Amino acid sequence: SKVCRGVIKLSSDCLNKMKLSDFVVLIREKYSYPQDISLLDASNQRLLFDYDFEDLNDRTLSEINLGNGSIILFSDEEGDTMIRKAIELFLDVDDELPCNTCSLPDVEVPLIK
Amino acid sequence: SMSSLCLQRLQEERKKWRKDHPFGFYAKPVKKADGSMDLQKWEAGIPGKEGTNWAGGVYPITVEYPNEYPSKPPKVKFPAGFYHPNVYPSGTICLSILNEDQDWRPAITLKQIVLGVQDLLDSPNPNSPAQEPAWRSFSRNKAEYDKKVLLQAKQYSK
């Protein structure tokens, strides 16, 4: 009940071309996260990207084993008083939306202590 | 099977560590087959104190977090066969702040743990005989003990 939630609608084509670095850019600017973030695979609980771990920066979403029905956790990792609430993101890829589709859900994510 | 509080607290631990960790120590989550990190298993290194027989060595530990962390303490291990009166043959360190029934409290950071382990190196605790041969040497053949320690310092040279 603490983590915010939303479903991303993706194209099967988009999942193979989407770069992890830009995927982070998209999520950060939609929900007003700060610079220092961390990105987990919420199912198997692997750490895939953060402010220091940039090994996977260049890989595509499929190249880091994210597919249909994978869930992502995105957290505020800045260590300030006001912290942006964590959002959990489901990955629903359907057949077929226009290719190169990555529509992030409208979610009211608050600033908490 | 990690609780969301465990995930939250582990990400914060990695962050506090980045900002503030003791000089000469290192601690980093393990990398897995797929190239990703495992937040539950960390590799760290403990430098021996200068002006002691442990000087010059950096001693490797693994910090393994239970699914119930921070309710339950991490498991900290030197390599199996590591030589110290308070280290089991398996490599498990005996420290009261790592015991759920003793001095462990959820507020205990990775910093406090690694400093505690470092203090243990040169000051073995008599209420924790965990390794028989090492305890025997320490108690009644200090020259055989010191020598073994100096060898181990060289073995784990920086």
Author numbering:
A (entry chain C): 439 to 551
B (entry chain B): 0 to 157
The authors write:
A transthiolation reaction ensues during which Sumo is transferred from Uba2 to the catalytic cysteine of the dedicated Sumo E2 conjugating enzyme, Ubc9. In addition, for both yeast and human Uba2, the ufd has been implicated in Ubc9 recruitment. Therefore, to obtain a more detailed understanding of Uba2's ufd interactions with Ubc9 and to obtain broad insights into how E1-E2 specificity is established in general, we performed structural analysis of the Uba2ufd-Ubc9 complex from S. cerevisiae.
In order to understand E1-E2 interactions in a Sumo pathway, we determined the crystal structure of a Uba2ufd-Ubc9 complex from yeast. There are two molecules per asymmetric unit, which superimpose with 0.3 Å root mean square deviation (rmsd) over all alpha carbons, so only one version of the complex is discussed here. Ubc9's Lys30 from one face of the β1β2-loop forms a salt-bridge with Uba2's Asp493. Finally, docking the Uba2ufd-Ubc9 structure on prior structures of full-length Uba2 indicate that the Uba2 ufd would need to undergo significant rotation so that the Uba2 and Ubc9 cysteines could face each other.
